[PDB]
Every structure is written in C-alpha cells, then in structure tokens.
Design an enzyme around this catalytic site. Structure first.
Site, mmCIF file in Angstrom:
data_model
loop_
_atom_site.group_PDB
_atom_site.id
_atom_site.type_symbol
_atom_site.label_atom_id
_atom_site.label_comp_id
_atom_site.label_asym_id
_atom_site.label_seq_id
_atom_site.Cartn_x
_atom_site.Cartn_y
_atom_site.Cartn_z
ATOM 1 N N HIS A 34 0.868 -1.250 -0.044
ATOM 2 C CA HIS A 34 -0.157 -0.094 -0.036
ATOM 3 C C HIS A 34 0.802 1.274 -0.080
ATOM 4 O O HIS A 34 0.520 2.422 -0.240
ATOM 5 C CB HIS A 34 -1.008 0.117 1.237
ATOM 6 C CG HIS A 34 -0.177 0.501 2.441
ATOM 7 N ND1 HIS A 34 -0.045 -0.650 3.438
ATOM 8 C CD2 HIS A 34 -0.058 1.356 3.234
ATOM 9 C CE1 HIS A 34 0.583 -0.323 4.370
ATOM 10 N NE2 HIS A 34 0.438 1.050 4.248
ATOM 11 N N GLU A 58 -0.188 -8.085 0.206
ATOM 12 C CA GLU A 58 0.605 -6.790 0.893
ATOM 13 C C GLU A 58 2.033 -6.816 0.818
ATOM 14 O O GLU A 58 2.616 -5.894 1.675
ATOM 15 C CB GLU A 58 0.044 -6.473 2.363
ATOM 16 C CG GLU A 58 -1.167 -5.503 2.496
ATOM 17 C CD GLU A 58 -0.822 -4.035 1.677
ATOM 18 O OE1 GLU A 58 -1.475 -3.987 0.913
ATOM 19 O OE2 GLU A 58 -0.116 -3.318 2.188
ATOM 20 N N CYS A 134 5.393 2.335 7.277
ATOM 21 C CA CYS A 134 5.195 1.265 6.663
ATOM 22 C C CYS A 134 6.187 1.024 5.579
ATOM 23 O O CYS A 134 6.885 1.841 4.943
ATOM 24 C CB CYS A 134 3.825 1.169 6.066
ATOM 25 S SG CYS A 134 2.484 0.825 7.378
HETATM 26 C C1 LIG Z 1 1.833 2.419 7.659
HETATM 27 O O1 LIG Z 1 1.254 2.862 6.449
HETATM 28 C C2 LIG Z 1 0.623 2.204 8.830
HETATM 29 C C3 LIG Z 1 1.489 2.118 10.083
HETATM 30 C C4 LIG Z 1 0.467 1.976 11.238
HETATM 31 C C5 LIG Z 1 -0.276 3.304 11.307
HETATM 32 C C6 LIG Z 1 -0.336 3.641 12.782
HETATM 33 N N1 LIG Z 1 0.717 2.836 13.392
HETATM 34 C C7 LIG Z 1 1.279 1.901 12.515
HETATM 35 O O2 LIG Z 1 2.234 0.929 12.623
HETATM 36 N N2 LIG Z 1 -0.219 1.317 8.256
HETATM 37 C C8 LIG Z 1 -1.813 1.363 8.441
HETATM 38 O O3 LIG Z 1 -2.287 2.460 8.705
HETATM 39 C C9 LIG Z 1 -2.443 0.162 8.181
HETATM 40 C C10 LIG Z 1 -2.726 0.302 6.591
HETATM 41 C C11 LIG Z 1 -3.635 -0.848 5.849
HETATM 42 C C12 LIG Z 1 -3.972 -0.450 4.530
HETATM 43 C C13 LIG Z 1 -4.382 -1.657 3.700
HETATM 44 C C14 LIG Z 1 -3.371 -2.720 3.758
HETATM 45 C C15 LIG Z 1 -2.935 -3.300 5.249
HETATM 46 C C16 LIG Z 1 -2.397 -1.991 5.987
HETATM 47 N N3 LIG Z 1 -3.723 0.263 9.014
HETATM 48 C C17 LIG Z 1 -3.759 -0.014 10.008
HETATM 49 O O4 LIG Z 1 -2.681 -0.308 10.742
HETATM 50 O O5 LIG Z 1 -4.969 -0.263 10.833
HETATM 51 C C18 LIG Z 1 -5.035 -0.249 12.218
HETATM 52 C C19 LIG Z 1 -6.238 -0.885 12.651
HETATM 53 C C20 LIG Z 1 -6.655 -0.745 14.020
HETATM 54 C C21 LIG Z 1 -7.425 -0.613 11.816
HETATM 55 C C22 LIG Z 1 -5.901 -2.586 12.485
HETATM 56 C C23 LIG Z 1 -6.956 -3.242 11.909
HETATM 57 C C24 LIG Z 1 -6.752 -4.610 11.607
HETATM 58 C C25 LIG Z 1 -5.579 -5.062 12.153
HETATM 59 C C26 LIG Z 1 -4.768 -4.367 12.634
HETATM 60 CL CL1 LIG Z 1 -2.996 -5.196 13.253
HETATM 61 C C27 LIG Z 1 -4.892 -3.028 12.983
#
Ligand SMILES: *[C@@H](O)[C@H](C[C@@H]1CCNC1=O)NC(=O)[C@H](CC1CCCCC1)NC(=O)OCC(C)(C)c1cccc(Cl)c1
Length: 168
Positions: A34, A58, A134
């Site tokens: 992403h 991913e 990321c």
């Molecule tokens: C890097 O882009 C970022 C790093 C995160 C942000 C906050 N602290 C971090 O380490 N990653 C994300 O924001 C990630 C993006 C998705 C987008 C589609 C493909 C997979 C990655 N989203 C994210 O971390 O979501 C957090 C939650 C709470 C929504 C979440 C949902 C489901 C499982 C998990 Cl482990 C977390």
C-alpha cells in the site's frame, strides 16, 4: 556492537512512496504494497518492462534487471520468522533518526486489515510505530547472517502489537 544492525544494513532502508522499502540485494527491493506509488512507468529510473514485480497479500517484491545497489551483498529473505523470534523493525524517520524496535513475533496468519487481505505475522513490541513507518523491514541475525522476513504493515490501536506482511 557487531550484532546490532550495522550501518550497511540501515543503508538498505530507502524512502519510497508513502513509506519505505528495503534492498535485499543489488537487484531486489521489497516493500508493503500500500505504500507503492501508483501509475508510474519506471522505478529508480528503470522501465517496468525491465522489472519483475510480484505483489500478494500486502508484500511487494521488485526484481531489477540491473544492479541498482552494487555495494550490497545478497541476504536471505524468509517467509516470516518462527514464532518467538525476537526481530528488529528498522524504522527510519524523516528526521534522520534510526529507531530499531524490538518485536517478539507471533504466528503467521491471514488477516483482514481495512478491507485488504494481509499475509501477515503479528508481533509484540518489547517506542512505537506511526503513519509513514510502513515498508520498514523486520530483520533478525541468525548466527553470522542477517535475515529479512517481513515489511511493516499495521499496528493495533494500543500500538503494542504490530503486523508485518510476509512473502508466500
Ligand atoms: C503504515 O502505512 C501504517 C502504520 C501503522 C499506522 C499507525 N501505526 C502503524 O504502525 N499502516 C496502516 O495504517 C495500516 C494500513 C493498511 C492499509 C491496507 C493494507 C494493510 C495495511 N492500517 C492499520 O494499521 O490499521 C490499524 C487498525 C487498528 C485499523 C487495524 C486493523 C486490523 C488489524 C490491525 Cl493489526 C490493525
């Protein structure tokens, strides 16, 4: 000391898209899907025609047809780490700070993260990750050689559990 990430290892971590990627070797670059830029016809000067791109779950791998980082040795890319392994997440910040985060890795599993299927491994932080981190690589030193086994993809709301995307 010798067993902390050496400078050459940090030099593989490269600002890319909306995050980072990692030179596994002079010709192979990995990142999380992403963060990859959209609608480009070349990466690092090279036309897509010259690049084998594999993207799944991913995890994104670029294999170039020219030595882009000839200064580097090739290191082992594994499909995740064994449960319990303590890895380091090699986090670079835009400030220039280097932030190796220690993570105890859990099990490899399929996960749904904001609608996308992630072939992931979770891990518990032993200092946290933020938006923009990321693509950062998950690495560990197995005896004499450094291994890379994933790229940073996500964290729980508490921030205490991270997920790296792993290759098939
Ligand atoms: C890097 O882009 C970022 C790093 C995160 C942000 C906050 N602290 C971090 O380490 N990653 C994300 O924001 C990630 C993006 C998705 C987008 C589609 C493909 C997979 C990655 N989203 C994210 O971390 O979501 C957090 C939650 C709470 C929504 C979440 C949902 C489901 C499982 C998990 Cl482990 C977390």
């Amino acid at each position: 000391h010798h067993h902390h990430a050496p400078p050459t290892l940090w030099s593989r971590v490269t600002k890319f898209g909306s995050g980072w990627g990692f030179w596994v070797s002079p010709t192979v670059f990995i990142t999380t899907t992403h963060v990859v830029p959209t609608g480009v016809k070349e990466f690092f000067g090279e036309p897509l025609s010259s690049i084998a791109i594999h993207q799944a779950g991913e995890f994104t791998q670029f294999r170039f047809s020219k030595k882009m980082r000839p200064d580097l040795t090739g290191m082992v890319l594994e499909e995740g780490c064994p449960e319990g392994t303590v890895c380091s997440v090699l986090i670079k910040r835009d400030s220039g700070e280097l932030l190796p985060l220690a993570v105890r890795m859990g099990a490899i599993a399929s996960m749904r993260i904001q609608g996308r299927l992630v072939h992931g491994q979770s891990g518990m932080l032993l200092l946290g990750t933020i938006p923009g981190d990321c693509g950062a690589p998950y690495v560990h030193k197995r005896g004499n050689d450094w291994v890379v086994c994933g790229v940073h993809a996500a964290a729980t709301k508490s921030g205490n559990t991270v997920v790296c995307a792993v290759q098939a």
